[PDB]
């Protein structure tokens, strides 16, 4: 007996062969935990260096059997249990975070089991910790794919309503809860001899009596997601929302990219099931029954396959432009006449806009006249054309780049004391206060993540700092009334505001495809391939700069043979940098018409809510919006008006939209039922070709 050619190549090489309810629950003795409690102890005993309670240890070491034994006589009201499961940790966890911190299927099925009972008064899996994670963000960060699927079935179970009574919505709720009871299927209670499998009362209150295990029987495949999308639509839901919500779960799970890219191509498949504009705005409509906007959701989860569709791009176009003004550029007559009216209307804007700011906020019927608009977008009322709000915030942006470049071009230290308080320098400082007040009220109005995602919201603040801290260091450090010091930083920060000024001017090509998808390309290989390559160069460059000093501390064959190592390594690095931008070019030039249309639809919606004013007037209107209440809208007209006009329809137009979406969605759900029927036949051909070659 000698091992084979396969045996001694592959086979395994080496020849193998207290108390205090703290270590009582961590080890798993059930009888020891009860006896120490009956004498007298604390069930929330806190250890110092990590705040771990006694309950929370049993969730940690997978001994759920303590947590069932706690249920027998040691909890009273159902509020007391939530005080004992959601106590805290030192990093911020609760019982369902520590049991999903590491993969503990036998315990995370228990905390899920108590939640479907309603034994907790809190949404125990929706809480957050101090890091910011979730009960499901922890199971996906570590990668515990066995308890992700237990979390995903619960989140797919809370979606379907309890109140509805329908055979297609009650079949795929008992189908989900059986997929967890079969997933436990063992691990009985602490007390032996009890009819309690792991899930009895949740299978009981479901109203469904039915009348060799494969891999598609114990997992969430495409067949059970189609069984949820059609069955959330039966209970009455936005089918464009349940697709957008189920995809936001599976993107969080991080280990299902077979179901994310199937659900992503189910929302593009649904969108072009419509024919016209009347059918697109039907299925995207938040009517009064299910007030759920999936347009407003998709530009909050950045849904690029949705937001760049050729139908969603035309329900935004009919609002922000609807006059073809963006295509008075590719012609000979449109540029010389449409551009001529641009400089006229901008001059008409700057000499009328502070006049209509103060008249809007005071008691006059011209605030009724400024509301006379915004239901039809045309040149009869140009102030509510969202393109004509974009053209004036760019024409005010170009002015700030000229007027600050005009400042450095006419500048010398020979000016007198009346130069710090100047008719030019002081006007460019109230601009930078109007910028910083705008970036504050674009931070709290939208949110932290919807503000720090554009890439220019840094450069709005930065040139509004390096000019505020230049005008301040002109009156604090320069000769007006103060002493003398080193003043190079005062003249250094001016170009720190002037470099970012003309770099800010490239935002005027945020429209214009073929000039557009280069600026994203320029700002993609600068935030991820410049700060990343210059760190690895820096730790290498410290090797040569210190290695240079060791040579000359105590000859040509010492240094020229040292230099050829440096010219090679600089070429061998520049070889790697050029192949790191030509890589990033190829990653963003293929999506050049999806990354552009998404970035276009995020400013056809940002400028469609906001007002026609304040690139400089956030210190001219905000000072009169508080006064108009003191003697009435500041930023509340973005949120009251619901982004469109084919939203919440009263009367008998809702009687047509719900009729219309039942001919779009029901003419979609019998198309996924046909494409998936071929996949049932796709993996069956060696049983169908064998029959047709037997019948023959």
């Amino acid at each position: 007996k000698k091992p084979s050619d396969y045996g001694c190549q592959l086979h395994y090489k080496h020849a193998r062969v207290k108390g205090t309810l703290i270590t009582a629950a961590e080890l798993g003795l059930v009888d020891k935990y009860r006896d120490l409690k009956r004498a007298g102890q604390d069930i929330l005993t806190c250890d110092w260096p990590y705040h771990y309670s006694s309950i929370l240890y049993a969730c940690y070491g997978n001994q759920y059997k303590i947590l069932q034994m706690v249920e027998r006589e040691f909890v009273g009201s159902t509020q007391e249990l939530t005080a004992m499961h959601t106590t805290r940790c030192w990093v911020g966890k609760n019982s369902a975070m520590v049991a999903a911190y590491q993969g503990h299927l036998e315990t995370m099925l228990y905390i899920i089991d108590l939640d479907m009972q309603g034994k907790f008064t809190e949404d125990l899996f929706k809480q957050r910790d101090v890091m910011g994670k979730n009960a499901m963000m922890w199971a996906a960060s570590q990668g515990h794919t066995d308890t992700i699927e237990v979390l995903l079935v619960r989140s797919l179970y809370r979606l379907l309503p309890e109140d509805c009574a329908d055979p297609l919505v009650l079949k795929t709720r008992w189908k989900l809860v059986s997929l967890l009871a079969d997933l436990a299927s063992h691990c009985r209670d602490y007390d032996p001899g009890c009819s309690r499998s792991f899930f009895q009362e949740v299978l009981a209150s479901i109203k469904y009596d039915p009348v060799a295990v494969k891999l598609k029987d114990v997992h969430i495949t495409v067949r059970t997601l189609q069984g949820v999308i059609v069955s959330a639509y039966r209970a009455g839901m936005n089918c464009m929302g349940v697709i957008m919500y189920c995809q936001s779960l599976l993107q969080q799970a991080r280990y299902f990219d077979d179901l994310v890219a199937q659900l992503t191509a189910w929302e593009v498949k649904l969108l072009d099931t419509c024919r016209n504009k009347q059918e697109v705005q039907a299925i995207l409509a938040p009517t009064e029954d299910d007030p759920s906007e999936p347009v407003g959701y998709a530009l909050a989860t950045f849904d690029k396959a949705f937001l760049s569709h050729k139908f969603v791009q035309q329900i935004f176009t009919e609002k922000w432009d609807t006059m073809g003004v963006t295509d008075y550029t590719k012609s000979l007559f449109g540029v010389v006449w449409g551009g001529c009216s641009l400089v006229v209307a901008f001059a008409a804007w700057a000499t009328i806009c502070p006049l209509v700011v103060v008249a809007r906020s005071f008691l006059s019927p011209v605030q009724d006249f400024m509301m006379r608009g915004k239901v039809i977008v045309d040149s009869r009322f140009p102030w509510h054309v969202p393109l004509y709000r974009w053209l004036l915030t760019q024409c005010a942006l170009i002015t700030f780049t000229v007027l600050l470049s005009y400042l450095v071009f006419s500048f010398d230290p020979s000016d007198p004391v009346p130069a710090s308080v100047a008719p030019l320098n002081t006007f460019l400082a109230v601009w930078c206060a109007a910028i910083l007040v705008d970036e504050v009220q674009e931070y709290v109005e939208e949110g932290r993540a919807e503000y720090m995602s554009s890439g220019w919201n840094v450069m709005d603040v930065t040139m509004a700092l390096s000019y505020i801290l230049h005008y301040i260091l002109r009156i604090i450090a320069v000769r007006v009334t103060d002493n003398l010091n080193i003043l190079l930083v005062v003249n250094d920060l001016l170009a720190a505001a002037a470099l970012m000024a003309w770099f800010r001017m490239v935002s005027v090509f945020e429209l214009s495809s073929a000039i557009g998808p280069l600026i994203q390309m320029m700002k993609q290989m600068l935030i991820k391939d410049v700060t990343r390559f210059a760190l690895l160069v820096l730790v290498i460059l410290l090797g040569f700069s210190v290695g240079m000093e060791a040579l000359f501390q105590e000859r040509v064959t010492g240094v020229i043979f040292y230099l050829i190592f440096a010219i090679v390594t600089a070429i061998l690095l520049l070889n790697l940098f050029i192949a790191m931008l030509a890589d990033t070019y190829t990653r963003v030039s293929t999506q050049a018409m999806v990354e552009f249309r998404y970035r276009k639809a995020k400013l056809m919606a940002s400028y469609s809510r906001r007002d026609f004013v304040c690139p400089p007037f956030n210190l001219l209107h905000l000072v009169c919006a508080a006064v108009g209440n003191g003697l009435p809208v500041s930023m509340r007209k973005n949120e009251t008006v619901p982004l469109f006009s084919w939203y919440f329809p009263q009367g008998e137009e809702m009687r047509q939209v719900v009729v219309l979406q039942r001919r779009v969605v029901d003419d979609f759900l019998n198309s996924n039922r046909v494409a998936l029927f071929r996949e049932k036949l796709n993996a069956e051909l060696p049983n169908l070709v064998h029959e047709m070659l037997k019948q023959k």
């Binding site: 039922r673 046909v674 998936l676 029927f677």
Partner: peptide, 15 residues
Amino acid sequence: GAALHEPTWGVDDGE
């Protein structure tokens, strides 16, 4: 041979 006609079977009969 039927310059724009082609034999068709049927895509239906799903679930």
